[PDB]
Design a protein around this ligand. Structure first.
Ligand SMILES: Nc1ncnc2c1ncn2[C@@H]1O[C@H](COP(=O)(O)OP(=O)(O)OP(=O)(O)O)[C@@H](O)[C@H]1O
Ligand SMILES: Nc1ncnc2c1ncn2[C@@H]1O[C@H](COP(=O)(O)OP(=O)(O)OP(=O)(O)O)[C@@H](O)[C@H]1O
Ligand SMILES: Nc1ncnc2c1ncn2[C@@H]1O[C@H](COP(=O)(O)OP(=O)(O)O)[C@@H](O)[C@H]1O
Ligand SMILES: [Mg+2]
Ligand SMILES: [Mg+2]
Ligand SMILES: [Mg+2]
Ligand SMILES: [Zn+2]
Lengths: 651, 223, 472
């Protein structure tokens, strides 16, 4: 039976509502702009915030979240109409324009555990971690055939009956003419869309402790396919649906369910920030107005809750900004990443600096001394066990590519692990091979490590070599080494205890009202949106209980994030005055007679020390947004290296 | 296994020498070792568990540790106890036992059936666990016995199973001294290869010290 | 309808079973909607013939019907594995097992490890009298669950009682003398235990840097004393509470581990005591003996309240917001006072993590045979109580105060604590300088925050939004 719907009142109302929501030109044209923008950069999926739809038309919003395919096909018809109105040529260039969904899903925000059968055919938001991706396969959507006998060319379309009943006539691939003349397929004239299945598991830190994990199968269709890789924490929005079984004759009543993605997104910490023109204006104002002391303003504003360690904070800012990688014509490579090691007495807030960089930096990976063991730290090679083939698995330092590995308790890490990270800490790559596969994975990361000295506490009366239990090969590739020392000076105690007690009295405005306790318990998280994939920004923090009062402000965390993102892209070029100063500075550093007696070397001075002078000067110039590495930048680099590389041995 | 004549039990109870008859009535096929027999009878009868409020558990189980140099009927004592006791199970510090000290979950070899294979400490919850060759245990076995013998429970966290399940057993163990010969010049603790926490959770420590005594040797040889 | 007890040892993923299906004919496209499905492990044979007739038109094929998956009413669906209760198995005897079938709201009512009583229909699988060896007429049994009861919420009466309990003048003394009343002595020990049971305030600063409010307590002592008994009491007294040793438990670990299943590729995380008691208390008994990776892990489980695991698969940061109540003995067994601080071999970094460390000694004073007599009375009067708080009410009160109130220091309290801290830091530096050894027990900013946490706990027992100078 083949009928057509002459009049579907519901479809008419739905399409009219969706086109009305999209036209948007009277209401500050946000989706008008979004559609012109997807036309511009040659996409065909429009990501629609359901909060905007809920504002403009709440009845559509409920219908769409609750009847996902009917409403989504209506909304994609409306979107194709809108694109054709804006541009008919682009609209005809694509057969289908898809709508992805975004925003706040009230009870439709689930995990693979709470995604139950009361959600079939509803739009849901599921968060989890990718356990297995499949290969990206093409699925034929339109097959073209040529008969050499009769010179005829035919074409046969295949509808997406992934979650609908498929009758066997729907999937017959034509091989013969009606006269039983052999057909031959035109592969370049046929249309294939690519297809991928992933499995999303409940995140290990969100699942109930001690229970086995729950997963959901997810279907990804064209332009959504390579969006996730195993081990990614993603958010998938799609329709939850029951897959058809194979034509049987007996059914057990059981259906495989699946999520048909309409949008996939990563952790929003690692995404390109949105930059309003006012933000770029503010950044330019900041950089131009304060240029000499902008670096110190950013540095002392780094971890405000940590008092002191101003040189450590300058170095950590340099790590957050980085040098510039050299890519020579013959393929030779020089790293622009800064590696920092903190060795110190117990409880001097070095685990806190590691954690701050974890919170702030994009693509920061945590690890502890024995939580990662070789293969878990760099890559791994396993066998697929279902295809028999070698498979590469990214470890911590590959996942931290263009990011930071924050290794804590670095000293308690085994010796083989540190040997393993030697090659990453200098070449920014992991060379891995079993016999069937060999690879050279990119791990362009900066390492921020915290260690404790031998004997637990630093001994003021012993050489830093005898007190840091690491060898010159490992130390030398840590381009800044800071001995964070617990001196029990009473005025220093005044300062620190005041700051600490002042941080233990602050209540967050509004949220806290006098006696509140923060915790929520395993439901309150899914009650509201995740602040990990969620979508006016000042420059300085207003005065508060964090600081008493003075004539020097505190850069806002959000503004600092935007500023550092902008400045990290800069590639300041070393000038000749800087080059001469750095060269002579390094030559002076190497010669020990310049440095006093009773002063030992924390780490050796090698050509790596020269490279790090260059890297630190470049990062400083990035902070000023200079585009040139001037003499002030070189001086700041040299003074940081001078502070770090020498320690006074007492007696 | 249910008693109908309490009358004979009570008549024996009035015998005024029932205690020594009971002590002489355990391990009849072991010659001598009367102190071990008193201790084993006491353990076999047990004390009174009690838990003031619900927060101060004190066991009534009398745990007995026989440490003695080889060939001194320790294993025969454990086998006697296994014969007499109801709900007694036998296990060894080696790998030569049907039941093991530690709980695990797996597919049963003969049943093919996914089973929480609760250990020998909880299979003897209301009875006695007999651990032979106590000093030759794993580290895993050692933490298992320590947990059961301190908390009287076993805590699983294996498959998706997070459970705590009760092991209110009396532990009777046999161990050998360090070097295969008890040295009375040292203390019991530095003779046995057991940590202090494990030893402290035993009420009776029977040092089964072997000496050459012609009369005792002759009586034993006759036996 | 049967009612059986048991322990659940496996719980399948919740899946979708249809209650109503609709089928469509392949040729005429007509549908046969809302066919009712039998509940339980029972299947359905599709009709082998289309209903619609039109004598002028030809007939439809033999087996024309296809499930339309979108027109199907599916419900939640779980299969469980029930084992015979371990206390119910006869002596020399393998346990029996039972398969359970749950439905729609009985799904996820239980987790493996729960002791349950089931009510359900003792039923066989009816999937078509097929799938043919030895056993004939045997069809697999299961219980179709109709009710699940798991064998083991502050009402305004309880809330009013908690308010009037906090409002007591001597609430601190009532709580302190109410914790381990059957343990003789150790009064300051018991006050510290109460403070650990309430905990300080967990704070997240604007910069994202968290500060813990959980209190860690260490008891070093002589083996006679009742410190394992104290740990046992505390794990019965706290809402979330786990008792373990430094080497974990029998078939449980101390910290978490992460493993990937090679077949399903799921990341399985084994729960150790540290992650199981999140939001509660871990009582690590025999703290001194612990495998090295566990020591390195509890370094940052005790301070950052997290466990960072990174395998070749993934990187995780598990939550361990737990107080640590630890007990250990001296390295010589007994304290051996002449050995100063050489009788503890804990590294300074571990001792720094502890808010309060208690050294416990068995003094050999003769009049402490009142302590013997005390034991004899406890064992006399045991089977058969003062003005204090029973265990269940204490648990509820602690949970209530933890969730309702999180105090902060007052300004003058902070001033006093700052000055006292500077004094004791100077004193510790001087004691190190005078003595010919670096002190085994450090006083650090971590101890400043420890005193802040104890003050906040004291204030939280009273439901007071601010901590005075009295509790400082
Ligand atoms: N200078 C400081 N400013 C602010 N807070 C501090 C400072 N020093 C220590 N602290 C506090 O001490 C506590 C412990 O700090 P942290 O855990 O970072 O120490 P650590 O140096 O990592 O110790 P370890 O080396 O033993 O791991 C933190 O809560 C931190 O707030
Ligand atoms: N006092 C005794 N009375 C009767 N039989 C004895 C006595 N002592 C030893 N035997 C006999 O000696 C043999 C060795 O006994 P058993 O195996 O119990 O010793 P053991 O202490 O287990 O030695 P090991 O420490 O090497 O295991 C047994 O067959 C037992 O019958
Ligand atoms: N002061 C005390 N009051 C009451 N009971 C005590 C006291 N000291 C020891 N005990 C008892 O001694 C037994 C063993 O003590 P335990 O706490 O297990 O020792 P340890 O300190 O070595 O762990 C316990 O049952 C405990 O009740
Ligand atoms: Mg630390
Ligand atoms: Mg033997
Ligand atoms: Mg103990
Ligand atoms: Zn038909």
């Amino acid at each position: 039976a083949g009928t057509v719907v002459l009049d579907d009142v519901e479809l008419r109302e739905a399409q009219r509502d969706y086109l009305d929501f999209l036209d948007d030109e009277e209401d500050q044209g946000i989706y008008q702009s979004k559609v012109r923008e997807l036309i511009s950069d040659n996409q065909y999926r429009l990501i629609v915030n359901v909060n905007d739809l809920r504002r403009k038309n709440e009845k559509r919003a409920n219908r769409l979240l609750n009847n996902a395919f009917e409403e989504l096909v209506a909304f994609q018809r409306a979107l194709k109409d809108f694109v054709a109105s804006i541009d008919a040529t682009y609209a005809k260039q694509y057969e289908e324009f898809y709508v992805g969904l975004e925003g706040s899903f009230g009870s439709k925000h689930v995990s693979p555990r709470t995604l139950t059968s009361c959600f079939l055919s509803c739009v849901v938001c599921v968060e989890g971690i990718v356990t297995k991706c499949s290969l990206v396969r093409p699925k034929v959507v339109r097959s073209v055939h040529y008969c050499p006998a009769t010179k005829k060319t035919i074409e046969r379309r295949y509808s997406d009956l992934t979650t609908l009943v498929a009758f066997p006539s729907s999937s017959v691939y034509p091989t013969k003419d009606e006269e039983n003349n052999p057909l031959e397929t035109e592969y370049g004239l046929s249309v294939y869309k690519d297809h991928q299945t992933i499995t999303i598991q409940e995140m290990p830190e969100k699942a109930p402790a001690g229970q086995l994990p729950r997963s959901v199968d997810v279907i990804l269709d064209d332009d959504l396919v390579d969006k996730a890789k195993p081990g990614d924490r993603v958010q998938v929005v799609g329709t939850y649906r029951c897959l058809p079984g194979k034509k049987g004759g007996y059914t057990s009543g059981t259906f495989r369910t699946v999520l048909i993605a309409c949008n996939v997104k990563q952790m929003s910490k690692d995404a390109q920030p949105s930059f309003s023109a006012e933000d770029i204006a503010k950044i330019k104002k900041f950089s131009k107005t304060r240029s000499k002391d902008i670096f110190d303003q950013l540095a002392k504003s780094l971890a405000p809750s940590i008092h002191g360690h101003d040189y450590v904070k300058k170095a950590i800012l340099c790590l957050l900004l980085g040098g510039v990688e050299r890519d020579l014509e013959n393929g030779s490579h020089i790293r622009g990443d800064i590696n920092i090691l903190l060795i110190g007495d117990p409880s001097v807030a070095k685990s806190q600096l590691l954690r701050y960089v974890l919170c702030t930096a994009p693509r920061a990976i945590p690890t502890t001394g024995r939580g990662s063991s070789g293969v878990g730290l760099t890559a791994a090679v396993t066998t697929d066990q279902e295809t028999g083939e070698r498979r590469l698995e990214a470890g911590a330092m590959v996942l931290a590519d263009r990011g930071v590995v924050c290794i804590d308790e670095f000293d308690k890490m085994s010796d083989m692990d540190r040997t393993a990270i030697h090659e990453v800490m200098e070449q920014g790559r992991v060379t891995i091979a079993k016999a069937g596969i060999h690879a050279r994975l990119n791990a362009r990361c900066s390492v921020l490590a915290a260690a404790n000295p031998v004997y637990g506490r630093y001994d003021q009366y012993k050489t830093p070599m005898e007190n840091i239990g690491l060898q010159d090969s490992l130390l030398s590739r840590f381009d800044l080494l800071f001995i964070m020392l617990d001196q029990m000076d009473p005025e220093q105690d005044r300062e620190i205890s005041d700051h600490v007690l002042r941080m233990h009295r602050y209540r967050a405005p509004g949220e806290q009202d006098g006696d509140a306790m923060p915790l929520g318990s395993a439901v309150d998280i899914l009650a509201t949106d995740d602040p990990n994939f969620s979508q006016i920004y000042e420059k300085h923090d207003n005065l508060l209980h964090g600081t008493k009062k003075k004539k020097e402000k505190m850069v806002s965390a959000a503004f600092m994030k935007k500023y550092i993102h902008v400045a990290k892209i800069i590639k300041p070029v070393l000038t000749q005055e800087s080059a001469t100063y750095i060269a002579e500075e390094y030559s002076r550093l190497r010669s020990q007679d310049s440095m006093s007696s009773d002063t030992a070397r924390t780490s050796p001075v090698t050509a790596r020390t020269l490279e790090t002078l260059i890297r630190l000067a470049t990062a400083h110039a990035k902070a000023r947004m200079s585009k040139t590495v001037d003499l002030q930048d070189a001086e700041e680099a040299v003074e940081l290296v001078q502070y770090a590389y020498f320690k006074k041995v007492l007696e | 296994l249910t008693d109908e004549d309490v009358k004979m039990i009570t008549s024996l109870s009035k015998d005024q020498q029932i205690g020594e008859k009971i002590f002489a009535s355990i391990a009849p096929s072991i010659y001598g070792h009367e102190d071990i027999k008193r201790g084993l009878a006491l353990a076999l009868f047990g004390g009174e568990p009690k838990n003031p409020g619900g927060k101060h558990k004190v066991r009534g189980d009398i745990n007995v540790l026989l440490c003695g140099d080889p060939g001194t009927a320790k294993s025969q004592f454990l086998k006697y106890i296994e014969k007499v006791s109801s709900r007694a199970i036998f296990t060894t510090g080696q790998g030569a036992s049907a039941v093991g000290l530690t709980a695990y979950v797996q597919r049963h070899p003969v049943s093919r059936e996914w089973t929480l294979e609760a250990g020998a400490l909880v299979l003897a919850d209301r009875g006695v666990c007999l651990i032979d060759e106590f000093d030759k245990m794993n580290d895993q076995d050692r933490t298992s016995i320590h947990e059961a013998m301190e908390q009287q429970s076993i805590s699983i966290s294996k498959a998706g199973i997070v459970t705590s399940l009760q092991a209110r057993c009396t532990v009777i163990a046999a161990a050998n001294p360090i070097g295969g010969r008890y040295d009375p010049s040292l203390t019991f603790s530095e003779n046995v290869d057991l940590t202090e926490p494990i030893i402290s959770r035993f009420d009776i420590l029977c040092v089964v010290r072997d000496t050459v005594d012609p009369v005792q040797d002759e009586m034993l040889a006759r036996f | 309808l049967v009612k059986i007890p048991g322990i659940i040892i496996a719980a399948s993923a919740v899946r979708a079973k249809a209650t109503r299906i609709s089928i469509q004919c392949r040729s005429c496209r007509n549908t046969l909607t809302n066919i009712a499905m039998r509940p339980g492990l029972e299947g359905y044979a599709l009709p082998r013939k289309c209903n619609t007739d039109q004598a002028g038109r030809p007939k439809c094929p033999l087996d024309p019907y296809f499930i339309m998956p979108d027109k199907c009413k599916c419900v939640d669906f779980q299969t469980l594995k029930l084992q015979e209760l371990p206390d119910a198995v006869p002596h020399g005897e393998m346990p029996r097992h039972m398969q359970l079938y749950c439905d729609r709201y009985l799904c996820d009512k239980v987790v493996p490890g729960n002791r349950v009583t089931i009510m359900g229909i003792y039923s066989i699988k009816k999937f078509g009298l097929t799938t043919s060896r030895v056993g004939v007429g045997i069809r697999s049994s299961y219980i179709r669950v109709l009710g699940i009861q798991v064998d083991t919420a502050v009402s305004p009466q309880e809330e009013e009682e908690f308010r009037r309990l906090a409002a007591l003048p001597n609430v601190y003394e009532v709580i302190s003398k109410s914790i381990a009343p059957s343990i003789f002595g150790g009064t300051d020990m018991k006050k510290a235990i109460a403070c650990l049971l309430f905990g300080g305030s967990r704070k997240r600063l604007p910069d994202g840097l968290t500060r813990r409010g959980d209190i860690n307590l260490l008891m070093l002592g002589d083996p006679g004393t009742a410190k394992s008994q104290l740990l046992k009491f505390v794990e019965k007294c706290s809402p979330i509470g786990v008792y373990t040793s430094g080497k974990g438990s029998s078939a449980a670990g101390l910290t978490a581990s992460v493993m990937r299943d090679p077949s399903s590729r799921n990341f399985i995380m084994e729960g150790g005591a540290m992650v199981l008691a999140d939001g509660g208390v871990v009582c690590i008994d025999e703290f001194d003996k612990m495998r090295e990776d566990d020591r390195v892990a509890i370094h940052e489980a005790m301070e950052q309240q997290t466990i960072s695991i990174a395998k070749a698969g993934i990187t995780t940061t598990l939550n361990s917001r737990c107080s640590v109540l630890a007990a250990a003995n001296s390295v010589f067994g007994r304290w051996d006072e002449t050995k100063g601080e050489d009788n503890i071999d804990f590294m300074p970094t571990i001792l720094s993590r502890f808010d309060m460390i208690f050294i416990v000694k068995d003094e050999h004073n003769e009049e402490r045979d009142v302590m013997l007599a005390k034991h004899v009375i406890t064992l006399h009067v045991s089977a058969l109580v003062e003005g204090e708080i029973d265990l269940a009410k204490l648990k509820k009160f602690i949970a209530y105060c933890r969730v309702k109130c999180g105090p902060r220091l007052s300004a003058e309290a902070a001033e006093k604590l700052k000055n006292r801290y500077i004094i004791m830091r100077s004193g510790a530096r001087q004691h190190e300088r005078d003595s010919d050894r670096r002190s085994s027990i450090p006083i650090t900013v971590r101890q400043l925050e420890a005193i802040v946490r104890i003050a906040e706990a004291l204030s939280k027992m009273k439901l007071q939004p601010f901590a005075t100078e009295a509790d400082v």
